[PDB]
Design a protein around this nucleic acid. Structure first.
Ligand SMILES: [Mg+2]
Ligand SMILES: [Mg+2]
Ligand SMILES: [Mg+2]
Ligand SMILES: [Mg+2]
Ligand SMILES: [Mg+2]
Ligand SMILES: [Mg+2]
Ligand SMILES: [Mg+2]
Lengths: 59, 142, 55, 94
RNA sequence: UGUUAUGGCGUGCCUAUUGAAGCAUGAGCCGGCGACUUAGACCUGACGUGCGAGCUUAAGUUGAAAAACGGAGGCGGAGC
RNA sequence: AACCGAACCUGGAGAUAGCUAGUUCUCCCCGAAAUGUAUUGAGGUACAGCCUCGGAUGUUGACCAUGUCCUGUAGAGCAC
RNA sequence: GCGAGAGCUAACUUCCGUAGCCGAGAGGGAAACAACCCAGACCAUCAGCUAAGGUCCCUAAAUGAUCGCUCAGUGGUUAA
RNA sequence: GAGUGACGAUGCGCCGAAAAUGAUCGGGGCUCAAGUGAUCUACCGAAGCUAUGGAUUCAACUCGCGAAGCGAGUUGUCUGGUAGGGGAGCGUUCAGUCCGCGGAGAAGCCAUACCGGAAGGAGUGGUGGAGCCGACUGAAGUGCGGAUGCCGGCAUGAGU
RNA sequence: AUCAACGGAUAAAAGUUACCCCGGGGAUAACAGGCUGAUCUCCCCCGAGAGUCCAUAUCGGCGGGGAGGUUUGGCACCUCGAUGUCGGCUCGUCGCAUCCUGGGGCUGAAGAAGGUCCCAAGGGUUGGGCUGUUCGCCCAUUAAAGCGGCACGCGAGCUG
C-alpha cells in the first residue's frame, strides 16, 4: 500500500518508485523509508522537495 | 496510523482512441480507472477516474485484425453454443472491443464489476459529447 | 581472508553441510576472518559456491 | 518507528518500544530525520542539526494477544499468551 | 463492545496413508456415560528416605479413638 | 416357532482376535524409521541399525589438508 | 537427478546404487500444484535489506538502457 | 550492360501439424515488443538476513544459603516437527490438616471489554435458596469430537 | 537328517465348497478411469518395380518418421464401511480421419459413368430375415445406407 502511494506521487512529478527511492538512497542523507508514504499523501509541498533532492543525487 | 479518504471529487477524463494500439490504450484507461496516481491512494474503494473514450472505431491493431484477433463468447449450455468473431467483424460493435479489453485488465470481484460503470466508450468524435455535461479534461496516451 | 555464508545449506550434500559447520558459519550473512593454511583454504574451496570471498 | 522517532510531530504523548529510563520525566533526545517546523522543510543530516525532546510518560504492557498455531492431521495445536512492553513518551521539542 | 460494507488472503475435522479438501473412513445436533488399570512377601531400573558391613521381618500374638511384640525365613557376605 | 451346510436359551465367556475402529488437560527440550539378517515368514515378530533420558570418559567426533598404501569402473586398446 | 539391470533407451512402471527433498517442512516462486527452485517458522512491530523468481494492466517493482534477430501471434503442440 | 550461378555451416522463422461439452500463453492483451540473443544497472520480492522489545534451552561467570542444588542476574547460544523419549505444571472428586465464608444469600446456572506463558483464574452483576471457597499433603471410577460408540432429548426430510 | 520348504513348527497329516460364514485389503485382481502406446488404427518419407512406353493417373517391395488413444495389453495410482457388469430400447449431443449431399485440383478426364486427392461437420444417414449378440452374413431399397467419443454415453430411465 505504502509503495503504491509512493510511485503514484513519484509519477506526479515525472518520476517513479524505482528511480525516486534510488535517489533518496544515493542521497545517503535521505533515509525516510518508513513515513515516506504519508508525506506523498498529506504534504505535497514537502513530497516535491524530496522528489527534487532524489533527482539530484541521481542525474 | 496510515492515511484514508474522502470522495468530494469525481474526475472525468477524455481519452482519444485514434491510432493507439489496443492493449497500449487499454492499459492507460484501466490504470486511470483503478487509481494510478490515486487521490487519497486506497484499495478498499473506488478512487478512480471516469474515463470517457472517443474514436473507438479508429483504434489500432498490429499484424492481424483479420486473423488471430477472435472474440470467443460461448452462449448457454454449449450444445455447440460456441460463438466466435474476427476483430475486423467488430464493425458492428467498436465500443465493445475497447470495453471488453479494458474490463479484461480490471479486478474481477464485487468491486471490480462496479468499476465497468466508470468506462464510457463511443465510436465518434463530436457525437460522444453525450456524457459530456460534467468535466472534459482531455488526457493523451503517450 | 574474509568469508561469508551467502547461500543456504538446505538441499546441499552432507559433506558441504559438515564443512560449513566446521567453518563456524551458522546463518546466512554470517561472516568470519580466515586462516591462510592449506586445510582452511581447502575447506573454503569445498563450499566455494556457498560463500562470498573478499581476498 | 524502528525505535526512536524523527519527523515534525507537535506536543503528542505517543507509545513506543521500552526505553529503559524508568519512571516519569526520564527525558529523551531524538535524532530527527525530517521537519516542517515553521513550514520550512529539511531532510537527512541537514535535519540532523535539529533534535526532538521527549518526556517518558509511562511503562506499560500492550493488549493481550494469543499466539495460536495449527497443523492438520499431525495433531499439532499450540496455545500461548503474549503482551508487548512499551514506553509512552510526551513530545515537547525543537 | 456489538454489527456491517469492501478489499487481501484462505482446500472442514479425524482416521488411514508414499500421498487426503478429497468424488477414501467415520459422523444429524446437544447433553451426559465412555478406554493403559489392579494384583503379587514376583523380576529388573531411576529417584527418595532409614539403618549400614550389615539390612529386614511373614504368618500370628497382645492391645486398638494406636501401635507394639513376633527372627521361622529372605537378601549382602566366594568363586569355579 | 418370521435368517438352519447343523434350532433356540443360559452358561464356559472378559474364548481367541498377528485384524479394523476408538484412546480424552497444557507448555517446554530432544527427535526417528520405513534398512540388514532370520522367520510355516512376507501388513506379524527377534536381534542389530536409527531416537531419547541418566551415569562415566572427556577430544577420541566432524569437515578439510598432507603423507602413504588399496582398487580395475569411465575412457581407451586389441597383445588373450 | 546421476549410475545400471528388467521393460519397448514405454509408464505417475519395477528393482538396486548414490545425493537431495516430501514423509515429519510452514514462508516466497513455479497460475493452480508433497517432491522442482529459493529458504528451515521462539513470540511481538502499520520498520530495513535481500534469494529464487520478477517490474504493460489484472499484480509488488524500469511501458529500463545499448547493439542485433524473428513478422510466424513464432513466442504460447513433436519428427523423418 | 553490370556482377551472377552452384555445394555446404550457422541464428531466428515456414510446411509437415487430424479427437471428441466451450474456448484461451493463467487472462486481458502484446510486434508502435509486453517475443528473443547479448551486456549493464535501479526497484520489487520470504516466517531467510537485519532493527528494536520480550521469553525460553543449554553453558560459563557472579551470588542469596549450614552444603550440594534451587532461585534470582549478566553475557553467549538455542528454540519446524510425526512415532517416540525426557522436563514443568493446570483442572476435577474424595480425604487429613489449617484458615475462613454463608439465609444482610452457599453450591450450581447465566453475562462480561479483567488477570496469568498455556492448561486456566478472579472481580462485578443477574438467577438460585443451603451449603462452601483458599493453602499444604494424600489417594483416584481424574480431563472426550470422533469409536456405523451407549442412554436421552431435540432437529432435517416437511406441513411433504 | 534330499529335517533339500536346507535357522530345521508334531514322533505322526490330502482334498473340496456354486451351501458357504467371519476379520480385513483399493497393501491386491476382474469393470471403468488414469499413466504408457508394444500391439491396434490412421497419416507422412524414400522411390525398386507394376502401369504396352512413363516411378508418382492409380498402385508403392525393402526400409524409415509421426499422430491418435476407439483394440488387446502393460502398470496397479483413487474407488473392495460397494464406482451395478454385455446387448437391446429411450433419449441425445459432440470429433472428423466425410458414407451422402456442397465447392475444388489432377486423371490412364471425349461425353456419360468413374478414379484419386484437397476444402467442408449444415442437415441427412431405410425397413426386414438369422443370432442375447455387438459385429457379420443374407433379402429388398436408397443420395447415402460413415467411422469414432461421451464410465466400451444413458438400469435413483426401462428391459434382463
Ligand atoms: Mg478401507
Ligand atoms: Mg469379546
Ligand atoms: Mg532428433
Ligand atoms: Mg459423539
Ligand atoms: Mg483396468
Ligand atoms: Mg465385471
Ligand atoms: Mg465432387
Amino acid at each position: 500500500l505504502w509503495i503504491q502511494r509512493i510511485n503514484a506521487g513519484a509519477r506526479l512529478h515525472g518520476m517513479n518508485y524505482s528511480t525516486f527511492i534510488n535517489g533518496l538512497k544515493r542521497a545517503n542523507i535521505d533515509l525516510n523509508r518508513k513515513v515516506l508514504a504519508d508525506i506523498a499523501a498529506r504534504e505535497p509541498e514537502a513530497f516535491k522537495a524530496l522528489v527534487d533532492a532524489s533527482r539530484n543525487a541521481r542525474q | 496510523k496510515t492515511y484514508i479518504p474522502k470522495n468530494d471529487e469525481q474526475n472525468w477524463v477524455v481519452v482519444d482512441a485514434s491510432g493507439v494500439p489496443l492493449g497500449r490504450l487499454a492499459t492507460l484507461i484501466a490504470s486511470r480507472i483503478r487509481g494510478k496516481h490515486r487521490p487519497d491512494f486506497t484499495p478498499n474503494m473506488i478512487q478512480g477516474d471516469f474515463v470517457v473514450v472517443i474514436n473507438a472505431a479508429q483504434v489500432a491493431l498490429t499484424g492481424k485484425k483479420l486473423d488471430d484477433k477472435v472474440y470467443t463468447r460461448y452462449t448457454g449450455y454449449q450444445g455447440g453454443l460456441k460463438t466466435e468473431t474476427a476483430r475486423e467483424a467488430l464493425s458492428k460493435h467498436p465500443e465493445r472491443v475497447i470495453e471488453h479489453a479494458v474490463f479484461g485488465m480490471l479486478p474481477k470481484g464485487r468491486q471490480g464489476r462496479a468499476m465497468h460503470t466508470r468506462l464510457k466508450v463511443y465510436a465518434g468524435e463530436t457525437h460522444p459529447h453525450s456524457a459530456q455535461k460534467p468535466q472534459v479534461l482531455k488526457t493523451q496516451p503517450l | 581472508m574474509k568469508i561469508k555464508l551467502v547461500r543456504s545449506v538446505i538441499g546441499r550434500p552432507g559433506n558441504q553441510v559438515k564443512t560449513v559447520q566446521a567453518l563456524g558459519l551458522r546463518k546466512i550473512g554470517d561472516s568470519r576472518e580466515v586462516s591462510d593454511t592449506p586445510a582452511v583454504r581447502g575447506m573454503v574451496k569445498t563450499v566455494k559456491h556457498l560463500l562470498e570471498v573478499q581476498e | 518507528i524502528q525505535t526512536g522517532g524523527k519527523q515534525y510531530r507537535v506536543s503528542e504523548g505517543d507509545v513506543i518500544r521500552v526505553e529503559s529510563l524508568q519512571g516519569e520525566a526520564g527525558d529523551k533526545v531524538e535524532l530527527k530525520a525530517l521537519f516542517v517546523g515553521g513550514e520550512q522543510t529539511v531532510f537527512g543530516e541537514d535535519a540532523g542539526k535539529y533534535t526532538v525532546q521527549a518526556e517518558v510518560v509511562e511503562h506499560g504492557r500492550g493488549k493481550k494477544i494469543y499466539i495460536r498455531k495449527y497443523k492438520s492431521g499431525v495433531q499439532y495445536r499450540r496455545r500461548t499468551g503474549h503482551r508487548q512492553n512499551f514506553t509512552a513518551i510526551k513530545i515537547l521539542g525543537i
